[PDB]
Amino acid sequence: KSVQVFIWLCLILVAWILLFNHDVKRSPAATKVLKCITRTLISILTGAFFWLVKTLLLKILAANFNVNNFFDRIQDSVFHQYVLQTLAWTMRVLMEALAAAYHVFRNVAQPFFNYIEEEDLLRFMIKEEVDLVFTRKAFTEWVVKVYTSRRALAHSLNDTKTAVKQLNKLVTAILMVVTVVIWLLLLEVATTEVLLFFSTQLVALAFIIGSTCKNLFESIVFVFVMHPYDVGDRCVVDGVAMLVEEMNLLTTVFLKLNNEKVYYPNAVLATKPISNYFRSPNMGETVEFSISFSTPVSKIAHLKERIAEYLEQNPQHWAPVHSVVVKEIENMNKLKMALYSDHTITFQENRERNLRRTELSLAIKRMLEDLHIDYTLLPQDINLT
Amino acid sequence: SRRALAHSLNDTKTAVKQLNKLVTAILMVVTVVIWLLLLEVATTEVLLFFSTQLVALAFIIGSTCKNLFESIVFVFVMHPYDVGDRCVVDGVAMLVEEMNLLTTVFLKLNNEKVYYPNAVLATKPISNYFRSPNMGETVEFSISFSTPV
Amino acid sequence: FQENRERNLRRTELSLAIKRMLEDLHIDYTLLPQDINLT
């Protein structure tokens, strides 16, 4: 549409120029109005070119956001469509897009059949498709997680669209003011002195509002170019974790672990480190405990073997890889000990991570209790009088 | 090691490609404006209005391409580290993941992704484990003052 | 230090060796004696 209107306007301008290109001076009054009209056509042509470049910038930004998120958005949409069947166009579909779902899934599954019914999937989709898509409780949990992910993707898309719309409004206002001033200058109504007075007032005001649109530009380049995080991702700033809520050009709203709303200046974040749990791979875990310096090495080996067995017998929560490291020796009476292991998920699920850490700590406590590992304070010698 | 070298080469190629795109856009805008000026279509007053708008916008986007230039001179000229090398910043170790013109992605010991502004790193010390020689070790323990020599 | 896991394991092994060697040598640490006057 933009190129069509641009060609329309340019053809109109050239046609007008050709008609009056001939040197036919109807009257001195006609010349002034003709010059004013031509200046108006040139000014509106410049405005149309500005609009074209503006929409080009907006479209390239939208395409960058698409390459960033629309792939996962379309994947989630396809997964949801496949699940529903078992039980651009992609951008439009994404924009358009618990107990009840679990009940529906259970009803679809054959009675007294915990595993997914192959016949039901086959009748609704091909066997290969069903296998690729693939415990009633596990299926319900997966459906709930997929729905939550789709909702988060929709919220992220809406936030990005709102930010792009606000940026479009701002740049359109800038274009409007630029084109009106361009038309005024072309019309040549103001004399010299007033023009330089306007110029000096303009450089003054330019410094004034530059002191702020510098921060604005930093914020937009931060949110767009670096793109450290998306909506709904858990991030840590200054050592405190929080969840992204709203993406604005000048600010970003975050929710702390205590459901406390926080407002941040986007410009400041550009000068601070940002960590993302959602984008990070499976995260590690650390536990701390201490034992006596007199503990035999055999007990330490037994504890290591028990830890390895416990970790390998629970793959769903902890990966087989693990390590036990001695930190430091305190007066050769206390031996600092720590265990390192990796979850099967990231820190995004804070509640699940905390529960798993508590379970691991309880397991370590029990295992230490059975092994009879004891810690004793340094003996004190007392001389009576 | 071969996989790490391939990843480093790919990251360097991607950074060079992005820099090429940026400089090519700058060249394109420069040449179009040069052609427009040579054609001599605009009159005087509009030319100085364009000039003042240009110096204004130049300050605006300079406030940021200054940091951009600092980041590129940091990643290229100093070249403190490569992809896959373990580095320590502010006393915390991490692993290089992605090399971007404006930022560098690092992974902490807990497999925690971190994003840094490349401009800031230029003003902070950087230590590289991969490029360093064999490292030392220290252990701490205490004994009684009455221990015989 | 690039191999953080290997470095940590080697440090732990060295610490255990130091612990054992100190244990065999019978090196002991004692807190400063405290004098108590009853009433």
Residue numbers in the entry:
A (entry chain A): 248 to 334, 387 to 396, 432 to 468, 481 to 731
B (entry chain B): 495 to 643
C (entry chain B): 693 to 731
Paper text:
In addition to the characteristic TM4-TM5 CLD, we observed an inter-subunit salt bridge between E534 and K539 at the extracellular end of TM5-TM6, which is unique to AtMSL10. We introduced two single-point charge reversal mutations at these two positions, E534K or K539E, to disrupt the inter-subunit salt bridge interaction. Surprisingly, both mutations virtually maintained the wild-type channel activity, as assessed in excised membrane patches from Xenopus oocytes. We determined the cryo-EM structure of K539E at ~3.7 Å resolution, which represents an open conformation nearly identical to that of the wild type (r.m.s.d of ~0.3 Å for all Cα atoms). Interestingly, densities corresponding to the TMD and the TM4-TM5 linker domain are better resolved in the K539E mutant than in the wild type. Thus, the extracellular E534-K539 salt bridge between two adjacent subunits in the heptameric AtMSL10 channel is not required for the non-domain swapped arrangement or channel gating by membrane tension.
